[PDB]
Design a protein around this ligand. Structure first.
Ligand SMILES: C=C1/C(=C\C=C2/CCC[C@]3(C)[C@@H]([C@H](C)CCCC(C)(C)O)CC[C@@H]23)C[C@@H](O)[C@H](CCn2ncnn2)[C@@H]1O
Length: 253
């Protein structure tokens, strides 16, 4: 069959809304970064020192916090999201925030040097900057892998924003009350994505890109799980909370 239906009027609207939501919640110039607590890079080419200093934690905690604020904004503009009870909106936001952050951060990730460049160089983040924030290689290295695997999908922005949307509106998050509603909205988003890929993505000699995109959603669950383990450890460090933000405290704590 290899049927390739045209995007409906509704699907076109969903895409345009999502593109626009993303353009309003993602600054590709990174002009707000001067407002974050400054990056501090103490020398160490050591878990003990990293935990003792947490020199990068205030800057990256502010980075992530600001990003959670943006994701919330993004989430609210997803068609259907506001049809959910505010209870379910919060469950979905809290459990997906780290995953969407990892997704959206791919826009700053570059394979030039395997860094997130929001730059200049003060605002370039590498493996070692993230260890200076108290995380370890068990999270960071798979995160870099995931970023690369994700660049090599060469997603259209349409596919990129749809993926984050699909990520947020997942029916099987623990503590969701109306799984059916959530699943209906997700299916509309997946159906749009599936339709978009078949229409607009060259060639196809086959439709594997959708499966590859859903695989990334599963990778993200692991990354989420691992971050959660490591955040818990972070929070065992005395005076750690002041280096975070209320939003970061509430979302992961
Ligand atoms: C968080 C983002 C960016 C990079 C993400 C990174 C690089 C550094 C380390 C990060 C934050 C990872 C770590 C493990 C999070 C650690 C969080 C804590 C609370 C300390 O456990 C997850 C994604 C990793 C930059 C950038 O892509 C964007 C920043 C904000 N922004 N810029 C334009 N629009 N929104 C994005 O939201």
């Amino acid at each position: 069959d290899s049927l390739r239906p045209k995007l409906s009027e509704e699907q076109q609207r969903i895409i345009a809304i999502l593109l626009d939501a993303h353009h309003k919640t993602y600054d590709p110039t990174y002009s707000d970064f001067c407002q974050f607590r400054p990056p501090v890079r103490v020398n160490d080419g050591s878990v003990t020192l990293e935990l003792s200093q947490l020199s990068m934690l205030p800057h990256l905690a502010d980075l992530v916090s600001y990003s959670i604020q943006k994701v919330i904004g993004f989430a609210k503009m997803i068609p259907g999201f506001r049809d959910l009870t505010s209870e379910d909106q919060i469950v979905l936001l809290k459990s997906s925030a780290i995953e969407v952050i990892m997704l959206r951060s791919n826009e700053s990730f570059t394979m030039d040097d395997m860094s997130w460049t929001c730059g200049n160089q003060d605002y370039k983040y590498r493996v070692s900057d993230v260890t200076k924030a108290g995380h370890s290689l068990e999270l960071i290295e798979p995160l870099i892998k995931f970023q690369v695997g994700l660049k090599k999908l060469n997603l259209h922005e349409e596919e990129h924003v749809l993926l984050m949307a699909i990520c947020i509106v997942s029916p099987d998050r623990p503590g969701v009350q109306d799984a059916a509603l959530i699943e209906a909205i997700q299916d509309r988003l997946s159906n749009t994505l599936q339709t978009y890929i078949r229409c607009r993505h060259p060639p196809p000699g086959s439709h594997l890109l959708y499966a590859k995109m859903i695989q990334k959603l599963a990778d993200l669950r692991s990354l989420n799980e691992e971050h959660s383990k490591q955040y818990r450890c972070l929070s065992f460090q005395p005076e750690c909370s002041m280096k975070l933000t209320p939003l970061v405290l509430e979302v992961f704590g």
